[PDB]
């Protein structure tokens, strides 16, 4: 169903995470690109 | 459709903030804001 | 000095958030009509408030009591500066409050519920295909 | 079952309504064409 | 298409047929004149 990283923030069934400690969490973190906001303001809460 | 038709901003009559809001209206309408907009809140957010 | 802005709540123009209970003032609500208030305050330097109407109508004028209700009636009597909501441009709005261009295009539809045979095998030719096939 | 408004108004086993006090129900209540009013008719009997 | 607008009836600023040129396209957009005028001039008159 899923065929690219924008899928993932347009849809709300499947959820998604990431290590607590690593680097994809401050990449997603610190990420100025608004669907990657997007996806780490969804995991954040 | 039964018609064609369309949602307005709306100001008390003789309030100054009517050209203001309707400068900013077609702004937001020439830069793609409000296409953007409803891209986001309709088509975007179909879970169907 | 703030200026008050009615709207409704209608998905997805005003949405409450999930934890709204837990914030206050314009953080609560979501939407397209919030995100088209913060930028419509944006371009012309002004602080909102954000107010949904009372009575969670839209506005008419009563037949016999002659006073509006809803958003127009907010609007006429002072009650409010600026209403961000999906309000349709009428002649009768027209004539008491001032609309600015439309923002979104619409119209009236009808919505209803959502809702072969077995001789689905004579299908992929016409009717008189077979009646020309038996002459 | 229903393709258009014409279809609506012959009908008679399918109720249809509108909002109270919205633009919808005004277009009915002051509209000129004999659909419409037959519509507007149906719905406020 | 990649915007959405639309045609209006343009008069000088501050000129006194501003609302009432409002106020009829708008009454001739409520009775449906503008439809017809459209079908009549577009559909109606299909030549393919």
Redesign the interface.
């Given at each position: 169903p899923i065929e690219s990283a924008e899928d993932l923030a347009?849809?709300?069934?499947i959820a998604y995470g990431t290590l607590d400690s690593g680097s994809t969490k401050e990449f997603f973190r610190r990420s100025k690109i608004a669907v990657y906001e997007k996806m780490w303001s969804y995991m954040k809460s | 459709?039964?018609?064609?038709?369309?949602?307005?901003?709306?100001?008390?009559?003789?309030?100054a903030?009517?050209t203001?809001?309707?400068?900013?209206?077609?702004?937001?309408?020439?830069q793609?804001?409000?296409?953007k907009?409803?891209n986001k809140?309709?088509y975007?957010?179909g879970?169907c | 000095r703030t200026?008050v802005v009615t709207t409704i709540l209608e998905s997805?123009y005003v949405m409450y958030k999930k934890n709204h209970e837990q914030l206050e003032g314009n953080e609560r609500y979501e939407?397209?009509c919030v995100?088209?208030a913060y930028?419509?305050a944006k371009?012309?330097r002004?602080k909102y408030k954000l107010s949904i109407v009372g009575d969670g109508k839209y506005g008419a004028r009563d037949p016999e009591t002659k006073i509006w209700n809803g958003?127009?009636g907010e609007?006429?009597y002072?009650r409010?500066?600026?209403?961000?909501?999906?309000?349709?441009?009428?002649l009768v709005?027209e004539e008491?409050?001032?609309?600015?261009?439309?923002?979104?295009?619409?119209?009236?539809?009808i919505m209803i519920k959502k809702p072969p045979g077995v001789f689905s095998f004579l299908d992929p030719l016409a009717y008189e295909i077979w009646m020309c096939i038996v002459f």
């Open positions: 347009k849809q709300t069934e | 459709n039964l018609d064609s038709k369309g949602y307005g901003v709306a100001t008390p009559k003789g309030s903030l009517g203001p809001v309707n400068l900013a209206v077609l702004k937001l309408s020439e793609g804001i409000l296409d907009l409803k809140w309709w975007d957010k879970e | 200026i997805p939407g397209y995100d088209l930028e419509i371009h012309v002004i958003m127009v609007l006429v002072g409010a500066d600026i209403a961000v909501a999906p309000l349709t441009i009428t709005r008491v409050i001032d609309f600015s261009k439309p923002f979104m295009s619409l119209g009236i539809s």
